[PDB]
């Protein structure tokens, strides 16, 4: 970090967006990127992976998000 990575976000119907981001971005910031790139609103997005619900104010780096990582995208 700062270090550019990409993340893949898949929703339950199989729609996929791959987002370029930086390890210092927050989860809330990624969600803003996701939102813009999928026609939705950042505050209606939930990001998970298995048992982890990502908190908005934590950076990707502190969540140890790796390059290429697949995240689960949900709507609220």
């Amino acid at each position: 970090g700062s270090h550019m990575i990409e993340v893949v976000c898949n929703d339950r119907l199989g729609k996929k967006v791959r987002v370029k981001c930086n390890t210092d971005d927050t989860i809330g910031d990624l969600k803003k990127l996701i939102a813009a790139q999928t026609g939705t609103r950042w505050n209606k997005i939930v990001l998970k992976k298995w048992y982890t619900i990502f908190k908005d104010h934590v950076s990707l780096g502190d969540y140890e998000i790796h390059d290429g990582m697949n995240l689960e995208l949900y709507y609220q």
Binding site: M4, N22, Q37
Partner: peptide
């Protein structure tokens, strides 16, 4: 997916720093 430069312009628009 968006290029680095297209991502950077979007980032700029959202108040985020460059990649």
């Amino acid at each position: 997916s968006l290029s680095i430069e297209e991502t950077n312009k979007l980032r700029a628009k959202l108040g985020l720093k460059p990649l």
